[PDB]
Amino acid sequence: MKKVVTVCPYCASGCKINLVVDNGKIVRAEAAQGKTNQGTLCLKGYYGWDFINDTQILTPRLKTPMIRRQRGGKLEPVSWDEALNYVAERLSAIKEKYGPDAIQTTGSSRGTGNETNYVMQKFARAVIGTNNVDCCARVXHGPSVAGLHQSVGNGAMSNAINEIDNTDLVFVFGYNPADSHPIVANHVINAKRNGAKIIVCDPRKIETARIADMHIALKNGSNIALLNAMGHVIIEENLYDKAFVASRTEGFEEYRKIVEGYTPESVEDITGVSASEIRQAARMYAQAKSAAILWGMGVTQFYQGVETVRSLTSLAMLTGNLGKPHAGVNPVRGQNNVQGACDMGALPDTYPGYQYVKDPANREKFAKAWGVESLPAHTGYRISELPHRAAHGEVRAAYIMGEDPLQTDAELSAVRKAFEDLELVIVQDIFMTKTASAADVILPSTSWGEHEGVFTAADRGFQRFFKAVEPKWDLKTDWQIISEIATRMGYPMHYNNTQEIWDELRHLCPDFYGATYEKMGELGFIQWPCRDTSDADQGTSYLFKEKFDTPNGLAQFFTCDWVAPIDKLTDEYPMVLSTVREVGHYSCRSMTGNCAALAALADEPGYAQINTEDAKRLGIEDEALVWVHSRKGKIITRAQVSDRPNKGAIYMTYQWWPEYKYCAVRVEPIADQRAAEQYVIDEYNKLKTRLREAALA
Ligand SMILES: Nc1nc2c(c(=O)[nH]1)N[C@H]1C(S)=C(S)[C@@H](COP(=O)(O)OP(=O)(O)OC[C@H]3O[C@@H](n4cnc5c(=O)[nH]c(N)nc54)[C@H](O)[C@@H]3O)O[C@H]1N2
Ligand SMILES: Nc1nc2c(c(=O)[nH]1)N[C@H]1C(S)=C(S)[C@@H](COP(=O)(O)OP(=O)(O)OC[C@H]3O[C@@H](n4cnc5c(=O)[nH]c(N)nc54)[C@H](O)[C@@H]3O)O[C@H]1N2
Ligand code: SF4
Ligand SMILES: [Mo+4]
């Protein structure tokens, strides 16, 4: 019996886990003394390791490569040699004929690791010769990045997760850590425990709200309105940090100009918050010696999402809550490694280390390092643009690794036809997902407990995770697959281990250079920038101490006018629909749902939080399956009646097989519940056998 140290592959909290191995199998998992979790794990880290053993509760783990040698296809098992040769040849042929930009590749924000993301972007750039690399996941706060990037020059959490504990005030906005990042919620509770004030801006009465000094339950979608009003009060009452605004920012006057009209009274009906509440929240935020803002999707998944991010960052600027510890602007994003995949350059406009491909010097260094004449300089296509690029014949092949767009992208039928429009779709995954079943070629890889690497936690903290068990089938790591394809296409690539990949990149990225494997060790948490390999350099806790990373080093102010959501509530669709998380289960459902204990927790079709009062009116009972109506939309879900959601809006999840946070719908009860249940079991059985029939063939 031995314990192998790893990092949770669920959410970005970065909890260290000791996987206990006995014989050649993982026996159980227990918390380790990581930087962030310090001996605590939530339900998913504790029980979510089971999926590695191919339980088949939902879908089987991929065991062999496959090729569908005819669109009306029999996806048939094949040797690695046939798969790899097939891909390298198709890609070469597509490239020569239509050009490198005719192929699209994806990074992956899950259990694969940073190293393989560096290998895929290298593959796209040095081998195919395109900048078409991108992560879907990087919509975990896609808007956050550039939005935040224009205000501050860096889209990362400005301060450490561990710095939260000592904030004087936590400003939670469109963020529900209790379900989303359990271990980060603990840091917030500990902050309150150390004596911090807490303000929660959220429509729903989430867990955090109950410990909050002030719960600002604004109306779904009234974001910029309240934000402008708060900025208004802060300036009106002279609560801003003038010295800071003068020496470190730009844009005050134009911001001030706009927020002027946004008096608290003027926005009481739009936000549904009383002016005194607004003023009080604004003063509490302004009065705190140090305040930290944490946000999530309730900010980004809105048309005015990108605006709200910059609008919040402005409050932080106004109050000089940047450049010091226990403060900051902190988008706590989703996946265990959404941060890493970005840090590794799995983006169409930067090499790893946030070294823009548009810089001739950056290209010179990389092209030299990669032993290549020229590296493309123009931005690549974004994975979100696939349907469109495929339809118009601009991208002829998609190399999708560790993503499930045929389950996760909006209006999935769109991606089904893109797949239909593409000449070739390669899907490299760990499970027979809906996306994998639609592919032309499946390339099976190792999973999280079967390989090693590094992940970057929510706050840019690099961490090592180790291989705890061998794959039981003939699998290759994602980077071995890409490397061999690269080699068969004429570009020599092979690595003996992930440290070979890491050291290579360390040498090509100044801000990552000091974070050696040794420094990270089994429990080191090293936040970049980490420039010197010397033990004296343990990383950077908070960003912007001296300057701001914007071209002229000053943060940039911004807000705009509040604009009501696109979905007009009607007498026909009187309710607002918004999605939300819940522990137990995790996004894609492929891992969480293939764990015996976790699958026991989540029911099909899944819940829809409905407000006690709303339900009564509509004649909807708790646990009762229900109908949710929209334009060209009707979904069946189980009602979870409660006082938590706010009257007028229902909150479903999406972890079941664009202004995503606001949608006008009409919830209606079901009479023949028994005919509804059977329908659900029926559809679920159908999909399950489908995927099974695809893999087990
Ligand atoms: N409609 C809609 N679209 C969205 C969002 C939304 O909420 N709604 N949100 C955005 C956000 S925040 C996110 S997080 C994304 C999420 O969407 P995706 O990026 O698709 O994320 P997952 O669905 O978690 O898919 C990860 C896949 O990688 C596979 N995988 C896991 N480990 C490995 C590995 O080691 N190797 C390989 N090759 N594969 C592996 C898993 O089995 C799974 O199939 O979508 C974004 N776009
Ligand atoms: N258990 C579990 N945890 C997860 C995941 C999972 O699948 N399961 N997925 C991970 C991933 S990939 C992601 S992207 C994150 C997403 O997690 P979060 O960023 O926490 O996002 P949600 O819970 O979807 O929405 C956050 C909050 O925004 C609030 N909100 C909605 N509309 C508004 C608004 O108009 N204004 C304001 N102020 N608030 C609003 C909602 O009530 C909700 O409480 O979770 C991650 N953690
Ligand atoms: S908080 Fe997140 S990273 Fe930690 S054990 Fe739970 S799912 Fe894993
Ligand atoms: Mo996400």
PDB file of N, CA and C in Angstrom, residues 297-359:
ATOM      1  N   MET A 297     -19.278  33.303 -13.311  1.00  0.00           N
ATOM      2  CA  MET A 297     -20.061  33.413 -14.548  1.00  0.00           C
ATOM      3  C   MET A 297     -21.229  34.371 -14.563  1.00  0.00           C
ATOM      4  N   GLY A 298     -21.913  34.512 -13.413  1.00  0.00           N
ATOM      5  CA  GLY A 298     -23.050  35.435 -13.281  1.00  0.00           C
ATOM      6  C   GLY A 298     -22.679  36.837 -13.766  1.00  0.00           C
ATOM      7  N   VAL A 299     -21.377  36.993 -14.015  1.00  0.00           N
ATOM      8  CA  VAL A 299     -20.792  38.198 -14.548  1.00  0.00           C
ATOM      9  C   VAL A 299     -20.570  37.964 -16.051  1.00  0.00           C
ATOM     10  N   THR A 300     -19.743  36.981 -16.399  1.00  0.00           N
ATOM     11  CA  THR A 300     -19.406  36.747 -17.803  1.00  0.00           C
ATOM     12  C   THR A 300     -20.418  36.220 -18.802  1.00  0.00           C
ATOM     13  N   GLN A 301     -21.314  35.326 -18.400  1.00  0.00           N
ATOM     14  CA  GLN A 301     -22.305  34.793 -19.344  1.00  0.00           C
ATOM     15  C   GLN A 301     -23.525  35.697 -19.499  1.00  0.00           C
ATOM     16  N   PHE A 302     -23.257  36.902 -19.981  1.00  0.00           N
ATOM     17  CA  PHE A 302     -24.253  37.932 -20.212  1.00  0.00           C
ATOM     18  C   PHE A 302     -23.699  38.775 -21.342  1.00  0.00           C
ATOM     19  N   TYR A 303     -24.586  39.364 -22.148  1.00  0.00           N
ATOM     20  CA  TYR A 303     -24.184  40.224 -23.264  1.00  0.00           C
ATOM     21  C   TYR A 303     -23.311  41.338 -22.685  1.00  0.00           C
ATOM     22  N   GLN A 304     -23.727  41.863 -21.536  1.00  0.00           N
ATOM     23  CA  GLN A 304     -22.948  42.901 -20.886  1.00  0.00           C
ATOM     24  C   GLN A 304     -21.932  42.291 -19.910  1.00  0.00           C
ATOM     25  N   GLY A 305     -21.623  41.011 -20.116  1.00  0.00           N
ATOM     26  CA  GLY A 305     -20.679  40.312 -19.264  1.00  0.00           C
ATOM     27  C   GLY A 305     -19.282  40.907 -19.272  1.00  0.00           C
ATOM     28  N   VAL A 306     -18.739  41.087 -20.466  1.00  0.00           N
ATOM     29  CA  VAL A 306     -17.415  41.672 -20.624  1.00  0.00           C
ATOM     30  C   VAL A 306     -17.397  43.058 -19.964  1.00  0.00           C
ATOM     31  N   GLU A 307     -18.518  43.776 -20.079  1.00  0.00           N
ATOM     32  CA  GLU A 307     -18.671  45.107 -19.484  1.00  0.00           C
ATOM     33  C   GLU A 307     -18.677  45.052 -17.965  1.00  0.00           C
ATOM     34  N   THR A 308     -19.447  44.121 -17.409  1.00  0.00           N
ATOM     35  CA  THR A 308     -19.562  43.961 -15.961  1.00  0.00           C
ATOM     36  C   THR A 308     -18.211  43.674 -15.306  1.00  0.00           C
ATOM     37  N   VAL A 309     -17.386  42.854 -15.957  1.00  0.00           N
ATOM     38  CA  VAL A 309     -16.058  42.518 -15.469  1.00  0.00           C
ATOM     39  C   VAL A 309     -15.224  43.799 -15.314  1.00  0.00           C
ATOM     40  N   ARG A 310     -15.204  44.625 -16.346  1.00  0.00           N
ATOM     41  CA  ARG A 310     -14.462  45.888 -16.337  1.00  0.00           C
ATOM     42  C   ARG A 310     -15.123  46.889 -15.381  1.00  0.00           C
ATOM     43  N   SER A 311     -16.435  46.775 -15.257  1.00  0.00           N
ATOM     44  CA  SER A 311     -17.191  47.646 -14.385  1.00  0.00           C
ATOM     45  C   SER A 311     -16.846  47.372 -12.908  1.00  0.00           C
ATOM     46  N   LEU A 312     -16.655  46.100 -12.575  1.00  0.00           N
ATOM     47  CA  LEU A 312     -16.288  45.696 -11.225  1.00  0.00           C
ATOM     48  C   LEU A 312     -14.862  46.105 -10.963  1.00  0.00           C
ATOM     49  N   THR A 313     -13.974  45.767 -11.893  1.00  0.00           N
ATOM     50  CA  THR A 313     -12.557  46.091 -11.762  1.00  0.00           C
ATOM     51  C   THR A 313     -12.372  47.572 -11.471  1.00  0.00           C
ATOM     52  N   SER A 314     -13.252  48.399 -12.022  1.00  0.00           N
ATOM     53  CA  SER A 314     -13.224  49.842 -11.789  1.00  0.00           C
ATOM     54  C   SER A 314     -13.467  50.184 -10.313  1.00  0.00           C
ATOM     55  N   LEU A 315     -14.392  49.476  -9.662  1.00  0.00           N
ATOM     56  CA  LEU A 315     -14.651  49.726  -8.247  1.00  0.00           C
ATOM     57  C   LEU A 315     -13.375  49.481  -7.480  1.00  0.00           C
ATOM     58  N   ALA A 316     -12.638  48.434  -7.873  1.00  0.00           N
ATOM     59  CA  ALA A 316     -11.386  48.066  -7.222  1.00  0.00           C
ATOM     60  C   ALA A 316     -10.340  49.153  -7.445  1.00  0.00           C
ATOM     61  N   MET A 317     -10.354  49.741  -8.642  1.00  0.00           N
ATOM     62  CA  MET A 317      -9.429  50.812  -9.016  1.00  0.00           C
ATOM     63  C   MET A 317      -9.737  52.059  -8.216  1.00  0.00           C
ATOM     64  N   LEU A 318     -11.025  52.383  -8.195  1.00  0.00           N
ATOM     65  CA  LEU A 318     -11.549  53.547  -7.495  1.00  0.00           C
ATOM     66  C   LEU A 318     -11.119  53.504  -6.016  1.00  0.00           C
ATOM     67  N   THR A 319     -11.114  52.309  -5.444  1.00  0.00           N
ATOM     68  CA  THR A 319     -10.764  52.131  -4.053  1.00  0.00           C
ATOM     69  C   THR A 319      -9.304  51.694  -3.763  1.00  0.00           C
ATOM     70  N   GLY A 320      -8.459  51.715  -4.792  1.00  0.00           N
ATOM     71  CA  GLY A 320      -7.087  51.300  -4.610  1.00  0.00           C
ATOM     72  C   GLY A 320      -6.962  49.900  -4.050  1.00  0.00           C
ATOM     73  N   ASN A 321      -7.839  49.010  -4.486  1.00  0.00           N
ATOM     74  CA  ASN A 321      -7.826  47.639  -4.004  1.00  0.00           C
ATOM     75  C   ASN A 321      -7.116  46.719  -4.980  1.00  0.00           C
ATOM     76  N   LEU A 322      -5.943  47.141  -5.408  1.00  0.00           N
ATOM     77  CA  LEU A 322      -5.125  46.408  -6.360  1.00  0.00           C
ATOM     78  C   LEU A 322      -3.661  46.786  -6.063  1.00  0.00           C
ATOM     79  N   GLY A 323      -2.750  45.855  -6.288  1.00  0.00           N
ATOM     80  CA  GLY A 323      -1.358  46.116  -6.002  1.00  0.00           C
ATOM     81  C   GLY A 323      -0.934  45.813  -4.565  1.00  0.00           C
ATOM     82  N   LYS A 324      -1.843  45.266  -3.759  1.00  0.00           N
ATOM     83  CA  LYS A 324      -1.545  44.942  -2.359  1.00  0.00           C
ATOM     84  C   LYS A 324      -2.183  43.599  -2.068  1.00  0.00           C
ATOM     85  N   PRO A 325      -1.786  42.963  -0.958  1.00  0.00           N
ATOM     86  CA  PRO A 325      -2.325  41.657  -0.564  1.00  0.00           C
ATOM     87  C   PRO A 325      -3.712  41.741   0.099  1.00  0.00           C
ATOM     88  N   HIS A 326      -4.449  40.632   0.079  1.00  0.00           N
ATOM     89  CA  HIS A 326      -5.766  40.568   0.703  1.00  0.00           C
ATOM     90  C   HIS A 326      -6.741  41.580   0.096  1.00  0.00           C
ATOM     91  N   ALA A 327      -6.579  41.806  -1.203  1.00  0.00           N
ATOM     92  CA  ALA A 327      -7.421  42.717  -1.971  1.00  0.00           C
ATOM     93  C   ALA A 327      -7.472  42.096  -3.359  1.00  0.00           C
ATOM     94  N   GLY A 328      -7.670  42.925  -4.376  1.00  0.00           N
ATOM     95  CA  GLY A 328      -7.652  42.431  -5.734  1.00  0.00           C
ATOM     96  C   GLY A 328      -8.971  42.335  -6.429  1.00  0.00           C
ATOM     97  N   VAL A 329      -8.864  41.824  -7.638  1.00  0.00           N
ATOM     98  CA  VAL A 329      -9.964  41.572  -8.549  1.00  0.00           C
ATOM     99  C   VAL A 329      -9.677  40.076  -8.863  1.00  0.00           C
ATOM    100  N   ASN A 330     -10.638  39.200  -8.541  1.00  0.00           N
ATOM    101  CA  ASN A 330     -10.391  37.774  -8.669  1.00  0.00           C
ATOM    102  C   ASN A 330     -11.427  36.882  -9.320  1.00  0.00           C
ATOM    103  N   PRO A 331     -11.324  36.699 -10.635  1.00  0.00           N
ATOM    104  CA  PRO A 331     -12.306  35.816 -11.265  1.00  0.00           C
ATOM    105  C   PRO A 331     -11.879  34.395 -10.913  1.00  0.00           C
ATOM    106  N   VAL A 332     -12.659  33.689 -10.098  1.00  0.00           N
ATOM    107  CA  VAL A 332     -12.296  32.312  -9.755  1.00  0.00           C
ATOM    108  C   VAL A 332     -12.974  31.474 -10.830  1.00  0.00           C
ATOM    109  N   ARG A 333     -12.190  31.012 -11.796  1.00  0.00           N
ATOM    110  CA  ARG A 333     -12.744  30.230 -12.891  1.00  0.00           C
ATOM    111  C   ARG A 333     -12.894  28.740 -12.589  1.00  0.00           C
ATOM    112  N   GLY A 334     -13.659  28.074 -13.442  1.00  0.00           N
ATOM    113  CA  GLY A 334     -14.019  26.688 -13.259  1.00  0.00           C
ATOM    114  C   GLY A 334     -13.150  25.472 -13.166  1.00  0.00           C
ATOM    115  N   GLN A 335     -12.721  24.982 -14.323  1.00  0.00           N
ATOM    116  CA  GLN A 335     -11.934  23.763 -14.394  1.00  0.00           C
ATOM    117  C   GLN A 335     -10.621  23.696 -13.664  1.00  0.00           C
ATOM    118  N   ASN A 336     -10.235  22.488 -13.259  1.00  0.00           N
ATOM    119  CA  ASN A 336      -8.985  22.282 -12.534  1.00  0.00           C
ATOM    120  C   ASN A 336      -7.779  22.911 -13.201  1.00  0.00           C
ATOM    121  N   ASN A 337      -7.792  22.946 -14.528  1.00  0.00           N
ATOM    122  CA  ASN A 337      -6.672  23.509 -15.266  1.00  0.00           C
ATOM    123  C   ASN A 337      -7.099  24.421 -16.428  1.00  0.00           C
ATOM    124  N   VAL A 338      -8.078  25.283 -16.222  1.00  0.00           N
ATOM    125  CA  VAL A 338      -8.481  26.156 -17.322  1.00  0.00           C
ATOM    126  C   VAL A 338      -7.393  27.211 -17.366  1.00  0.00           C
ATOM    127  N   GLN A 339      -6.810  27.442 -16.199  1.00  0.00           N
ATOM    128  CA  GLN A 339      -5.746  28.405 -16.012  1.00  0.00           C
ATOM    129  C   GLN A 339      -4.512  27.899 -16.725  1.00  0.00           C
ATOM    130  N   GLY A 340      -4.159  26.646 -16.486  1.00  0.00           N
ATOM    131  CA  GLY A 340      -2.986  26.085 -17.100  1.00  0.00           C
ATOM    132  C   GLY A 340      -3.020  26.061 -18.602  1.00  0.00           C
ATOM    133  N   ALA A 341      -4.099  25.564 -19.183  1.00  0.00           N
ATOM    134  CA  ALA A 341      -4.195  25.497 -20.641  1.00  0.00           C
ATOM    135  C   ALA A 341      -3.930  26.866 -21.295  1.00  0.00           C
ATOM    136  N   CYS A 342      -4.293  27.940 -20.590  1.00  0.00           N
ATOM    137  CA  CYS A 342      -4.096  29.294 -21.094  1.00  0.00           C
ATOM    138  C   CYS A 342      -2.650  29.665 -20.888  1.00  0.00           C
ATOM    139  N   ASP A 343      -2.129  29.366 -19.697  1.00  0.00           N
ATOM    140  CA  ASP A 343      -0.730  29.613 -19.376  1.00  0.00           C
ATOM    141  C   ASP A 343       0.158  28.887 -20.414  1.00  0.00           C
ATOM    142  N   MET A 344      -0.295  27.737 -20.921  1.00  0.00           N
ATOM    143  CA  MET A 344       0.462  26.950 -21.929  1.00  0.00           C
ATOM    144  C   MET A 344       0.289  27.386 -23.397  1.00  0.00           C
ATOM    145  N   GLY A 345      -0.509  28.415 -23.628  1.00  0.00           N
ATOM    146  CA  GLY A 345      -0.654  28.914 -24.979  1.00  0.00           C
ATOM    147  C   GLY A 345      -1.596  28.184 -25.869  1.00  0.00           C
ATOM    148  N   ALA A 346      -2.560  27.500 -25.276  1.00  0.00           N
ATOM    149  CA  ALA A 346      -3.591  26.809 -26.041  1.00  0.00           C
ATOM    150  C   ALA A 346      -4.654  27.883 -26.356  1.00  0.00           C
ATOM    151  N   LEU A 347      -4.210  29.002 -26.945  1.00  0.00           N
ATOM    152  CA  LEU A 347      -5.020  30.160 -27.332  1.00  0.00           C
ATOM    153  C   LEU A 347      -4.547  30.571 -28.740  1.00  0.00           C
ATOM    154  N   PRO A 348      -5.445  31.117 -29.583  1.00  0.00           N
ATOM    155  CA  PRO A 348      -4.973  31.478 -30.926  1.00  0.00           C
ATOM    156  C   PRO A 348      -4.077  32.696 -31.113  1.00  0.00           C
ATOM    157  N   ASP A 349      -3.769  33.410 -30.035  1.00  0.00           N
ATOM    158  CA  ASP A 349      -2.940  34.610 -30.147  1.00  0.00           C
ATOM    159  C   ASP A 349      -1.701  34.715 -29.283  1.00  0.00           C
ATOM    160  N   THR A 350      -1.392  33.668 -28.534  1.00  0.00           N
ATOM    161  CA  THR A 350      -0.202  33.665 -27.686  1.00  0.00           C
ATOM    162  C   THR A 350       0.441  32.303 -27.544  1.00  0.00           C
ATOM    163  N   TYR A 351       1.754  32.362 -27.380  1.00  0.00           N
ATOM    164  CA  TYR A 351       2.554  31.193 -27.095  1.00  0.00           C
ATOM    165  C   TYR A 351       2.431  31.059 -25.561  1.00  0.00           C
ATOM    166  N   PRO A 352       2.951  29.975 -24.981  1.00  0.00           N
ATOM    167  CA  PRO A 352       2.843  29.897 -23.526  1.00  0.00           C
ATOM    168  C   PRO A 352       3.540  31.109 -22.867  1.00  0.00           C
ATOM    169  N   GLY A 353       3.186  31.413 -21.634  1.00  0.00           N
ATOM    170  CA  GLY A 353       3.838  32.514 -20.968  1.00  0.00           C
ATOM    171  C   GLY A 353       3.324  33.886 -21.354  1.00  0.00           C
ATOM    172  N   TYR A 354       2.194  33.936 -22.058  1.00  0.00           N
ATOM    173  CA  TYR A 354       1.566  35.188 -22.511  1.00  0.00           C
ATOM    174  C   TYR A 354       2.494  36.023 -23.351  1.00  0.00           C
ATOM    175  N   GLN A 355       3.098  35.342 -24.312  1.00  0.00           N
ATOM    176  CA  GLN A 355       4.036  35.876 -25.259  1.00  0.00           C
ATOM    177  C   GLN A 355       3.331  35.835 -26.614  1.00  0.00           C
ATOM    178  N   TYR A 356       2.714  36.965 -26.952  1.00  0.00           N
ATOM    179  CA  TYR A 356       1.956  37.143 -28.193  1.00  0.00           C
ATOM    180  C   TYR A 356       2.685  36.758 -29.464  1.00  0.00           C
ATOM    181  N   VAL A 357       2.014  35.969 -30.295  1.00  0.00           N
ATOM    182  CA  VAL A 357       2.591  35.508 -31.554  1.00  0.00           C
ATOM    183  C   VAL A 357       2.759  36.647 -32.551  1.00  0.00           C
ATOM    184  N   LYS A 358       2.132  37.789 -32.256  1.00  0.00           N
ATOM    185  CA  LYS A 358       2.215  38.952 -33.138  1.00  0.00           C
ATOM    186  C   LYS A 358       3.543  39.694 -32.986  1.00  0.00           C
ATOM    187  N   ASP A 359       4.329  39.297 -31.989  1.00  0.00           N
ATOM    188  CA  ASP A 359       5.607  39.931 -31.737  1.00  0.00           C
ATOM    189  C   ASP A 359       6.681  39.199 -32.520  1.00  0.00           C
TER     190      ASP A 359
END
